[PDB]
Amino acid sequence: DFHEDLMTHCGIELDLTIRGRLLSLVEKVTYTLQQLISETMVRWAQESVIEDPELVRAMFVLLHRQYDGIGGLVRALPKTYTINGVSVEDTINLLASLGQIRSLLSVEEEKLMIRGLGDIMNNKVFYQHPNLMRALGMHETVMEVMVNVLGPKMVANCCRFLCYFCRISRQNQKAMFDHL
Amino acid sequence: PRHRAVNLFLQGYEKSWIETEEHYFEDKLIEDLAKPRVDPLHQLILLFSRTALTEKCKLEEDFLYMAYADIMAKSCS
Known part of the structure; x- marks a missing residue:
């Protein structure tokens, strides 16, 4: 019922003066930079018919992100997360652990992982906040490692992890269901 | 709990009031790219x-294409 009670709160001012603070907030969320970021792409693309196709690809990503500054913000929101002020110190070293494995993704390769993943096995915020881990997508990161391996001892430590990923909640388990 | 409630409010506020139809810019955009050589x-x-x-x-996801297709799809007693 918890997500549904949130969904009941979500359809509050969709159609309480508490609803009034929300409606004021959405207008504020909406929006000189958006003009010029738009314009300079149009400046470039007009005058100087553009080769190096990498550029052109780069331009319209900024063009669309600037026009859609809502959908840009859409994709950011499932990744974003609020932690309490207490357990911030575990999260710092977590991302420092995870940043090592994102780094080691592009690869002794075996060794530093197990130290890295074993750190993630033991963090306080792996239990208390499973929704943060799925927002990290780090299961897939770990998965892609054993994708990369499986064409040896390195594997099982990922597999010890990915099991241990499944236990902590059910929508956290959903993610792994897609890779059966 | 508080941090948990602010968490699920975020995904709830994402799934409700950010799906806005304010995006009518597409017509103005595709007009704006159609200006002066190649346009x-x-x-x-x-x-x-x-x-x-x-x-x-095997084609990739290419979210660049996925965006401008949808712009151009929204480009149309």
């Missing part, structure tokens, strides 16, 4: 075309 809109188009002609044998 930018043709540059955008040809970008995707020459991408597609590469024999990848």
